[PDB]
């Protein structure tokens, strides 16, 4: 597709956003690869960091099952 971050001019990605960030994680808690998302390599490396921050702060689960 196209990089929506560049389309909307989103300079930085913050982990605090969840409603517009859940679209980049699969139902199993795995990150949607770039070949499927249609995202540039500049923003994929920032999306991964934001998702990791959210996982650390219990904003996005690592996987569907935890306990």
């Amino acid at each position: 597709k196209f990089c929506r971050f560049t389309a909307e001019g989103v300079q930085e990605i913050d982990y605090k956003d969840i409603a517009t960030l859940k679209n980049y994680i699969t139902e199993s808690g795995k990150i949607v690869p770039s070949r499927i998302t249609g995202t540039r390599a500049k923003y994929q490396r920032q999306l991964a960091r934001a998702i990791k921050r959210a996982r650390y702060l219990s904003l996005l689960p690592y996987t569907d099952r935890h306990q």
């Binding site: 699969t26 139902e27 199993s28 795995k30 569907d64």
Partner: protein, 70 residues
């Protein structure tokens, strides 16, 4: 993945949905590579061998459009 089946849903379609979810998650396909230890040397060799074929296919796709009508 949670595949809790609701009412008025056949077991056949429920099991097919569960199988499709497992396939898209790729959990079954990960054991065939996590069942043994791959050396970093072997992993890098496999990665380049897969990368070489992956654009060789596209190179041939873009090169076969010049001749060989059928």
């Amino acid at each position: 993945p949670v595949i809790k089946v609701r009412e008025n849903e056949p077991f056949d379609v429920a099991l097919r949905r569960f199988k499709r979810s497992c396939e898209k998650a790729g959990v079954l396909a990960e054991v065939r590579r996590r069942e043994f230890y791959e050396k970093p040397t072997t992993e890098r060799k496999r990665a380049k061998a897969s990368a070489v074929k992956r654009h060789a296919k596209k190179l041939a796709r873009e090169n076969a459009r010049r001749t060989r009508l059928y």
